[PDB]
PDB file of C-alpha atoms in Angstrom:
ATOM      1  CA  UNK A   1       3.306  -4.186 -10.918  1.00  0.00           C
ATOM      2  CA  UNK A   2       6.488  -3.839  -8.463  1.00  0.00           C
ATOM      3  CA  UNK A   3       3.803  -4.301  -5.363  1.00  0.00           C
ATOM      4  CA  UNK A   4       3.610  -7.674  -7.034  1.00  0.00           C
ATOM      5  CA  UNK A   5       7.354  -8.380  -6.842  1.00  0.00           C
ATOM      6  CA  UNK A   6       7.850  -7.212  -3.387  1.00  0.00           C
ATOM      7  CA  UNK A   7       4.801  -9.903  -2.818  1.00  0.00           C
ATOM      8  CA  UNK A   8       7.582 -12.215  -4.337  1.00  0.00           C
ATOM      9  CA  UNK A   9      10.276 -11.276  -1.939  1.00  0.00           C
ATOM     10  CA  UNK A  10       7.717 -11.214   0.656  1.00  0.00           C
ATOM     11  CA  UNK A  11       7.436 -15.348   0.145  1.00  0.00           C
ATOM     12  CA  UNK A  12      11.225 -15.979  -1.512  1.00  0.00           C
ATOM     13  CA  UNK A  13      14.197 -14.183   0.171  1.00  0.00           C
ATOM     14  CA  UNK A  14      11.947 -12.701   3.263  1.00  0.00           C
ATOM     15  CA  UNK A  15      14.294 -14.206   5.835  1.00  0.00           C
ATOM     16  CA  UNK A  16      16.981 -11.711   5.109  1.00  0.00           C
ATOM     17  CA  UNK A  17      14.196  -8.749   5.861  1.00  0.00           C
ATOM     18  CA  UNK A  18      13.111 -10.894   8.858  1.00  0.00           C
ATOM     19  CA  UNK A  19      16.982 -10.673  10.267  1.00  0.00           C
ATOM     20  CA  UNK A  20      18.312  -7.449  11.579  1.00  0.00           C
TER      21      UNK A  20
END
């Protein structure tokens, strides 16, 4: 499920998470 997409973001846009 959406755990599963966050685990996408998690390896694929990150970065922008990591900032800030």
């Amino acid at each position: 499920g959406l755990f599963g997409a966050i685990a996408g973001f998690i390896e694929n846009g990150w970065e922008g998470m990591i900032d800030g």
